[PDB]
Design a protein around this ligand. Structure first.
Ligand SMILES: [Fe+3]
Length: 316
């Protein structure tokens, strides 16, 4: 044992409970380094001497930043294979999803209500939604990843046409984050937004923002390819000094002792099949998740960035 060093983009309080439980079960000391927007630079600068064991981050774009900075090592683990569905881990064994986040469509509770069953992201590009849609910058990773999935499913031409239609329907210049779009729904600026599911929980947890969530309905797209999921996950650092402990830790985080808790704390979904979401998350509804591999989203990420620039999505 001795220890394991977790460099985390995610705030320590959102990961500490499961790490404390791991410590109790194994006797392995878990050190948390809050690398924040750090994280690649810090580990790269620390180089061969870096104590980093587990790199914990959020969004496939950040996972790819780590992999593409040559900071990952390949891990062969039957536990990770069994616990994590293949779509939420690397076929090339360098990264592993631990939770998912759904990119959903929020609607005005009063002015729209629940979306009809069958509603797709694609429907937001239809002319009837002109002036009614709020989305943050198209270059934001949450959106680029969604568009990358669309490239996989539909190709660049159809995705480009979608982006053009979506742009045409925006109520305002893309601005702010996902929560800001729901604030805009609350204030009647728009009736539809795209945003991550977990924000609904985060807003309800906040005294000011709860009214934003209360004015909106969370809708899980239910077209052909269902609801887009992105991930939080982990990578074992290239120069991990406590590799065995590190692998033990991520195996633990992938399993039934940690999955429910970790997802619950973050209002996310567990990756491990059979683990329930929290009561609050479950209450938002059940839905079909896209089966697309996150590595295929990563593959199309650059093309999606290119398409966003081509259509000048943020230009109003
Ligand atoms: Fe977020």
């Amino acid at each position: 044992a001795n220890e394991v060093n977790v460099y985390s983009y995610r705030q320590p309080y959102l990961i500490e409970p499961m790490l404390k439980n791991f410590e109790k079960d194994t006797g392995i000391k878990v050190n948390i380094i809050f690398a924040d927007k750090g994280l690649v630079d810090r580990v790269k600068q620390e180089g061969e001497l870096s104590p980093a064991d587990v790199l914990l981050t959020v969004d496939i774009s950040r996972v790819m930043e780590i992999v593409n900075a040559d900071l990952a090592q390949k891990i062969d683990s039957k536990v990770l294979e069994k616990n994590i569905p293949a779509q939420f881990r690397d076929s090339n064994d360098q990264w592993f999803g631990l939770t998912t986040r759904a990119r959903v469509i929020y609607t005005s509770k009063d002015r729209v209500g629940k979306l009809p069953a069958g509603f797709d992201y694609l429907d937001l590009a239809k002319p009837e939604y002109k002036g009614k849609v709020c989305v943050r910058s198209g270059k934001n990773s949450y959106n680029v990843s969604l568009f990358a999935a669309m490239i996989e499913h539909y190709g660049i031409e159809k995705t480009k046409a979608f982006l053009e239609g979506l742009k045409a329907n925006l109520a305002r210049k893309p601005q702010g984050g996902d929560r800001d779009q729901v604030k805009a729904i609350k204030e009647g600026i728009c009736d539809y937004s795209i945003g991550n599911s977990y924000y609904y929980g985060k807003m309800l947890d906040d005294e000011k923002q709860k009214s934003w969530a209360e004015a909106a309905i969370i809708n899980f797209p239910s077209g052909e390819h269902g609801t887009h999921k992105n991930i939080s996950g982990v990578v074992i650092a290239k120069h991990s000094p406590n590799k065995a402990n590190a692998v033990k830790l991520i195996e633990y985080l992938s399993g039934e002792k940690a999955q429910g808790l970790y997802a619950e704390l973050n209002h996310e979904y567990p990756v491990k099949e059979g683990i329930e979401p929290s009561a609050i998350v479950k209450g938002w509804g059940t839905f079909k998740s896209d089966t697309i591999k996150l590595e295929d989203i990563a593959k199309n990420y650059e093309a999606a960035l290119k398409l966003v620039d081509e259509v000048k999505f943020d230009d109003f």
